[PDB]
Design an enzyme around this catalytic site. Structure first.
Site: not given
Ligand code: CDL
Ligand code: CDL
Ligand code: PCF
Ligand code: PCF
Ligand code: PCF
Ligand code: PEF
Ligand code: PEF
Ligand code: PEF
Ligand code: HEC
Ligand code: HEM
Ligand code: HEM
Ligand code: FES
Lengths: 57, 385, 123, 247, 93, 126, 93
Positions: C69, C87-90
């Site tokens: 991403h 874990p930044c945008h799942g």
């Protein structure tokens, strides 16, 4: 006595620039002393001198 | 004749500073060029006095900048002066460019002046980028990574150009030492380009805010515009002193005080604020090749403006529609910077694309049509037939 | 080009190194994980590739640690699929490292590597 | 992004140093070094602060020397080339708790605690962020937060899940001056101390800024007068035009 | 030295303007003038004339672009909230 | 850059049409009043940028009384904008005073230069 | 532009030399000439003329300083030998 004032200070440019430099010397000393005094007096209680006096007392 | 005219070098200083005939009617917007020279002298002097203490290795870049901020006597003064003076360099540069765009200083005599100015703009953008990457914070490393990974979109030799710029396989020690050598060098190319700017200025003189000929009423530059520029020199020093001594980290991103970590993405990679409109014009295009081509075209579309300004009077002083669309261009630029500061989210993508289109339609579509319409209105408002 | 010895890496563990400024991990996959990797229909894949196309050694899964991403680090052996979780945008990836759910457009990139017995040379 | 991914923005506390004529409360710096050494020194490092910078700020010379002697650093090796340890001095730096990042991540559930030297200037909000992050640990996370094991909840952290447990409870540090060390008092003291570690130049910087603002504003007004003086002769010019005779 | 091209500016004496006749200039010595004359009248009146003349050109684009940026920012804060996640997934996918 | 012959062509087409005249002439009159060059004592043909050989030709061919009057209006506008004021309301250029005086000289020099270029690039029909 | 001082070099046309009448230049084209004409004659004859006229000024002072340097070097090498240590301590103390 603006004639005597001008004839002493602003007629000769050497006397003018020497007067300006003498005033700059005196103004540097006096201005730094007054600013440090006003700043330390404005922040009374937070300086290390005040904390040191509190620890000594 | 006088010794200021008869000497070899004092004739140059005389014919540029002392006897240089300026028009009488120029205003305080003509002080920004002398202010840019002052910014350049500030940047070069504080840069040398920090290069005496800075170390360009990738283990010692951030530690040496913090050595300047802590161990060097008045080194915080030099570092905040260099950083906020670079921000002020770009403020006064945008004002110089915008007053050129406004008062028509790009037209027929001064096309060489405008083009050398655009070359200086490109070199100053490059200097600011390399010097931001010299700190090696978190925004420095990742800004270097993004903007130099842009050149891997060229389909022939993109990987070759990228691994030649990096000096290796990512941004690393040879990249940071490369950038420090270049950040020392390129401001002297800026100083030589400023001397070429002054040549192209001197052969035809300054413009005035009326747009009319200034040969009739002129004033020697010494004793009038020397003190008229001294006013703005002290005002620039006052605002820079405020921003250096009271709000020194307002114009800086706070992520640069994290040391440069290649394994952590800081969740918003953003350059310095004066490159943010070009970062937005970059991110508007959904392709890596056309995006960097559009960013270079965003810097290079000012070269089209002498041949698209179809007006017959110079400068938007006396033009209503041109004045309105000039400030629409200015606030579009501010919108573009605020868009590029933002994340890549849903209203912001469309707003950035629309603002990029308005940015390019100002020079290419809006200016020729509006200036032609104003030519026709200026004719038929006073020709009776 | 680096060389990593595959002798001290036991079955069912990860090892995450840096290589050319990029994270790269090696996993000694279980046969349960191998069957689970080859036991997903490509219709469930926005960027469909196979385990034979994505690893050379099915025992040794080697891939770069860049989430596709924006470039964050997916956490080791975390998520809801048994793979890795950015874990930044799942973003989720399986043990084969392909994208199923999340804003990532492509799978986790495989670097170039060769084998020398019980060691690997990535480069 | 979302509000939970941004984190809650920390409110503006009336810090003693906010404001252009203000100085650090140096007694608050002394209390903050006490709460750094007694609590935060077990997980966080201060690798940029030498011992000699604390002399004249929060402690004296013979008071800093005892702490520096309490720690031990590496010496120059002896005549036989063996490694040798040395009791530390004023030139040495405040040591961290861990020998390397791998040992720090081993001790702290895999998460590396950052070195606290510049973190007041390294985070948005600054002092307000550090204060709200330390104080605002909710006892219970809000309903529905999927929390990982070993991660605590903090709203002001970006993402909601911080790896640092709440470490500041009441009366865990006995202050020297008898100041009642609650949680928010200790958090305010370490925020002032960490802000001094970030900007050790702050007091002298605002002092020279006062001098500079006064001198440059006076020069600006003097220069406006001198400019209008020199330009009086042109600004008060009068052009008249009698048209010439046609020839 | 060599001569250069035809410029539209000379130096003191041969500027290259028109011939001027009948235009008579009068100036006084600044030493016999009052500097800072009229500054309180111009500061409240001539400055108001200049602001009345040139504020629509600077303020209507400012109004348009600030209303646009504020509306886009409010739409983003609606989108990444809990009440507008259906519209968020609709306009994102 | 836009040729004056083209401006004359488009403006003559607008003025000779009865609908376009009554639609666009008041727009131009209010445009000229908002442009504000008359408040500085300038007519419009003082505003044309002279740094091109067609305009230098027309300004060489201007008669001398118009040249001296144009010189005074330009110097007066420079001094007026130097003082950051305007001229007083009886010193503003009236609407009937704002006549195109340089325009026949510009259009004649433009036609001469266009004919010279066209004869420089001819092709004799053989 | 502004004029500079009185110089002793003009440009092409107004150099500042005297008036010339009667001096007539003749020059044939190099494309009709022979370059490398006379290089072997002037290599051994003209070169010997130039060297013969201008070698005493360069060879007497070079010989003077080289003989001075060689004499000083030999005296130093004698002094710091074993045969001249008495003279060494005498001229050193
Ligand atoms: C409220 C504003 C009140 C003043 C006002 O009526 O402005 C009208 C005025 C319109 O006047 P105008 O006669 O139509 O055009 C003025 C010309 O610019 C003629 O310009 P000028 O010679 O009047 O100088 C304009 C400006 C000149 O301002 C500058 O050039 C900025 C220089 C900044 C130096 C430091 C830069 C630091 C980095 C950037 C921050 O300085 C002023 O506005 C002085 C006003 C008294 O608008 C402004 O000039 C606002 C400028 C704000 C910047
Ligand atoms: C270390 C190695 C280099 C040693 C250089 C030491 C001498 C320093 C000379 C300073 C530069 C200079 O003045 O040269 C200009 C001088 C000609 O310039 P000029 O202005 O006519 O001479 C004014 C002098 O006062 C000349 O006074 P002059 O006219 O009384 O003396 C005439 C004569 C003085 O006599 C000598 O020099 C004896 C030697 O000088 C010459 O004219 C010799 C000309 C030889 C040129 C041959 C041209 C060969 C072109 C074909 C070769 C193509 C290469 C292969 C291409 C392959 C392509 C794929 O050329 C030489 O002195 C040549 C020096 C020896 C070079 C090696 C000869 C090997 C021949 C094969
Ligand atoms: C790539 C090229 C980019 C180029 C763009 C970069 C960004 C823009 C740079 C700063 C703006 C520079 C504007 C310069 C134009 C200018 O000089 O304005 C003068 C005008 C009118 O002045 P005039 O046309 O000379 O008329 C005077 C004579 N009369 C006719 C009245 C008798 O006077 C006015 O109408 C008032 C204008 C005052 C402008 C102040 C700044 C306004 C914009 C600020 C934007 C930033 C602030 C927000 C930042 C978050
Ligand atoms: C400030 C509010 C200004 C309101 C306008 C006003 O009070 O009128 C102008 C006077 C005149 O002040 P001036 O502009 O220097 O004029 C000097 C005298 N003449 C040259 C006319 C002979 O202005 C004044 O006398 C105001 C002087 C008051 C100084 C302090 C103001 C706060
Ligand atoms: C020692 C030998 C060289 C010097 C002796 C000498 O002076 O020889 C003269 C000839 C060439 O003489 P030249 O000056 O080049 O010829 C120009 C045409 N002339 C003058 C005849 C009209 O010299 C020669 O032709 C000799 C050629 C020898 C080549 C040796 C190359 C090394
Ligand atoms: C230092 C003082 C040295 C002596 C000065 C003097 O004695 O001034 C004598 C000369 C002028 O002499 P003149 O032109 O009158 O004629 C000479 C024959 N009577 O001043 C100068 O050099 C010119 C001063 C201008 C300097 C401009 C500097 C700008 C660059 C920054
Ligand atoms: C390191 C920094 C050092 C800086 C020194 C610079 C000064 C040169 C020393 C000259 C020594 C000398 O001999 O100067 C003596 C000559 C004499 O003049 P004359 O021949 O006209 O009169 C001879 C009578 N027949 O000129 C001077 O009086 C020079 C005095 C003014 C100096 C000029 C100031 C510098 C302006 C530079 C402009 C820059 C443009 C370059 C763009 C890249
Ligand atoms: C293709 C074409 C597309 C068109 C796009 C839209 C363009 C709109 C044109 C520009 C609109 C703003 C300019 C208005 C004129 C102006 O600013 O007047 C400013 C005027 C003063 O002006 P003055 O005293 O100089 O008036 C000289 C003539 N009497 O104050 C006001 O009226 C105040 C209005 C109430 C508030
Ligand atoms: C023991 C273990 C401790 C103690 C006693 C303190 N901290 Fe804190 N801290 C710790 C870890 C493992 C982490 C990393 C968590 C993560 O990665 O998110 C932290 C983090 C911080 C931060 C950074 C927060 C952020 O990045 O936004 C700050 C600031 C911080 N810690 C400050 C701090 C202060 C002022 C303390 C005073 C006594 C303190 N910590 C105690 C581990 C531990
Ligand atoms: C063209 C003018 C210049 C510009 C625009 C410029 C710009 C910058 C910028 C923006 C930074 C980052 C500042 C920060 O955020 O900390 C920087 C850093 C730096 N620049 Fe420059 N610079 C200029 C000239 C120079 C020159 C000529 C030198 C060298 C002699 C120099 C030396 C440095 C150094 C050493 C840094 C390192 C970090 C620091 O101490 O600030 N600069 N430059
Ligand atoms: C280091 C940067 C620069 C310096 C020192 C500089 C210096 C100057 C100076 C001193 C002037 C004369 C004063 C004035 O008219 O304002 C000037 C004029 C000018 N500059 Fe710049 N300049 C710089 C950058 C630029 C840029 C980026 C441009 C835009 C492309 C530019 C375009 C112009 C133009 C068009 C003029 C003529 C303005 C006029 O006379 O009307 N310059 N410059
Ligand atoms: S960067 Fe991996 S989830 Fe967005």
């Amino acid at each position: 006595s603006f004639s005597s004032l001008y004839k002493t200070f602003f007629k000769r440019n050497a006397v003018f620039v020497g007067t300006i430099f003498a005033g700059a010397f005196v103004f540097q000393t006096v201005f730094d002393t007054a600013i440090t005094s006003w700043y330390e007096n404005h922040n009374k209680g937070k300086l290390w001198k005040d904390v040191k006096a509190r620890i000594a007392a | 004749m006088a010794f200021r005219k008869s000497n070899v070098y004092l004739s140059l200083v005389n014919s540029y500073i002392i006897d240089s005939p300026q028009p009488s009617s120029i205003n305080y917007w003509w002080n920004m060029g002398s202010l840019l020279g002052l910014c350049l002298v500030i940047q070069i002097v504080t840069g040398i006095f920090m290069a005496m203490h800075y170390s360009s290795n990738i283990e010692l870049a951030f530690s040496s900048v913090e050595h300047i901020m802590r161990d060097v006597h008045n080194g915080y003064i030099l570092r905040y002066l260099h950083a906020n003076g670079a921000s002020f360099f770009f403020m006064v540069m945008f004002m110089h460019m915008a007053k050129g765009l406004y008062y028509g200083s790009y037209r027929s005599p001064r096309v060489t002046l405008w083009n050398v100015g655009v070359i200086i703009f490109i070199l100053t953008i490059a200097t600011a980028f390399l010097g931001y990457c010299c700190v090696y914070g978190q925004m420095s490393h990742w800004g270097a990574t993004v903007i130099t990974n842009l050149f891997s979109a060229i389909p022939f030799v993109g990987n070759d150009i990228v691994s030649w710029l990096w000096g290796g396989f990512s941004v690393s020690n040879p990249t940071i030492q490369r950038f420090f050598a270049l950040h020392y060098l390129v401001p002297f190319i800026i100083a030589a380009m400023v001397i070429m700017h002054l040549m192209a200025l001197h052969i035809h003189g300054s413009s005035n805010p009326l747009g009319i000929t200034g040969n009739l009423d002129r004033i020697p530059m010494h004793s009038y515009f020397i003190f008229k520029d001294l006013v703005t020199v002290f005002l620039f020093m006052l605002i820079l002193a405020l921003f250096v001594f009271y709000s020194p980290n307002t114009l800086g991103h706070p992520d640069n005080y994290i040391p440069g970590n290649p394994l952590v993405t800081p969740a918003s990679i953003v350059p310095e604020w004066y490159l943010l409109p070009f970062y937005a014009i970059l991110r508007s295009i959904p392709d890596k090749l056309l995006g960097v081509i559009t960013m270079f075209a965003a810097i290079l579309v000012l070269l089209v403006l002498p041949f698209t300004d179809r007006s017959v009077v110079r400068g938007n002083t006396f033009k209503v529609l041109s004045k309105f669309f000039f400030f629409i261009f200015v606030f579009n630029f501010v919108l573009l910077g605020q868009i590029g500061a933002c994340h890549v989210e849903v209203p912001y993508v469309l707003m950035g694309q629309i603002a990029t289109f308005i940015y390019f339609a100002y020079f290419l579509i809006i200016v020729p049509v509006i200036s032609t319409i104003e030519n026709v209105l200026f004719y038929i408002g006073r020709v009776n037939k | 080009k680096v060389e990593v010895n595959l002798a001290a890496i036991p079955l069912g563990k990860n090892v995450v190194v840096k290589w050319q400024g990029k994270p790269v991990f090696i996993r000694h996959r279980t046969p349960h994980e191998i069957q689970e990797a080859n036991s997903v229909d490509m219709s469930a894949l926005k960027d469909p590739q196979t385990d034979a196309d994505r690893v050379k050694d099915p025992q040794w899964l080697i891939m770069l640690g860049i989430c596709t991403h924006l470039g964050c680090v997916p956490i080791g052996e975390a998520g809801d699929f048994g793979g890795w979780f950015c874990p930044c945008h799942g973003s989720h990836y399986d043990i084969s490292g392909r994208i199923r759910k999340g804003p990532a457009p492509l799978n986790l990139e495989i670097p170039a590597y060769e084998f020398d017995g019980d060691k690997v040379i990535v480069g | 992004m979302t509000a939970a991914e941004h984190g809650l923005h920390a409110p503006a506390y009336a810090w003693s140093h906010n404001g252009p004529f203000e100085t650090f409360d140096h007694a608050s710096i002394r209390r903050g070094y006490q709460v750094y050494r007694e609590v935060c020194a077990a997980c966080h490092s201060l690798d940029r602060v030498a011992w000699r910078t604390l002399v004249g700020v929060s402690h004296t010379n013979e008071e800093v020397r005892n702490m520096a002697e309490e720690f031990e650093y590496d010496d120059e090796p002896d005549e036989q080339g063996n490694p040798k340890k040395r009791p530390g001095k004023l030139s040495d730096y405040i040591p961290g708790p861990y020998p390397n990042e791998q040992a720090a991540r081993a001790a702290n559930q895999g998460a590396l605690p950052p070195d606290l030297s510049l973190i007041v200037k390294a985070r948005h909000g600054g002092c307000d962020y550090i204060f709200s992050l330390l104080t605002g640990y909710p006892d219970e996370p809000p309903a529905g937060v999927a929390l990982p094991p070993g991660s605590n909840y903090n709203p002001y952290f970006p993402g909601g899940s911080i790896a640092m447990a709440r470490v500041l409870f009441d009366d865990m540090v006995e202050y020297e001056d008898g100041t009642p060390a609650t949680t928010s008092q200790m958090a305010k003291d370490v925020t002032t101390f960490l802000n001094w570690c970030a900007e050790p130049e702050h007091d002298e910087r605002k002092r020279l800024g006062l001098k500079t603002v006064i001198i440059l504003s006076s020069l600006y007004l003097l220069s406006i007068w001198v400019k209008k003086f020199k330009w009086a002769g042109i600004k008060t010019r009068k052009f008249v035009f009698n048209p010439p005779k046609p020839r | 030295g060599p001569p250069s091209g035809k410029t539209y500016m000379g130096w003191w004496g041969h500027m290259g303007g028109p011939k001027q006749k009948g235009i008579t200039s009068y100036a006084v010595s600044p030493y016999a003038q009052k500097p800072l004359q009229g500054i309180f009248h111009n500061a409240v009146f001539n400055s108001f004339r200049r602001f009345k003349s040139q504020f629509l050109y600077v303020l209507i684009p400012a109004g348009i672009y600030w209303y646009w940026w504020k509306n886009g920012n409010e739409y983003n804060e609606f989108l990444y909230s809990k009440a507008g996640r259906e519209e968020l997934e609709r306009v994102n996918v | 850059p836009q040729s004056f012959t083209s401006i004359a062509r488009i403006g003559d087409y607008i003025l000779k049409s009865p609908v376009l005249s009554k639609l666009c002439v008041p727009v131009a009159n209010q445009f000229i009043n908002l442009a504000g060059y008359k408040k500085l004592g300038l007519k419009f043909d003082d505003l044309i940028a002279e740094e091109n050989p067609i305009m230098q030709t027309a300004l060489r061919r201007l008669p001398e009384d118009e040249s001296y009057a144009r010189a005074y209006r330009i110097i007066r506008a420079h001094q007026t904008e130097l003082t950051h004021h305007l001229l007083p309301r009886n010193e503003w250029i009236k609407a009937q005073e704002d006549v195109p005086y340089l325009l026949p000289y510009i259009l004649e020099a433009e036609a001469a230069a266009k004919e010279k270029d066209e004869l420089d690039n001819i092709e004799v029909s053989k």
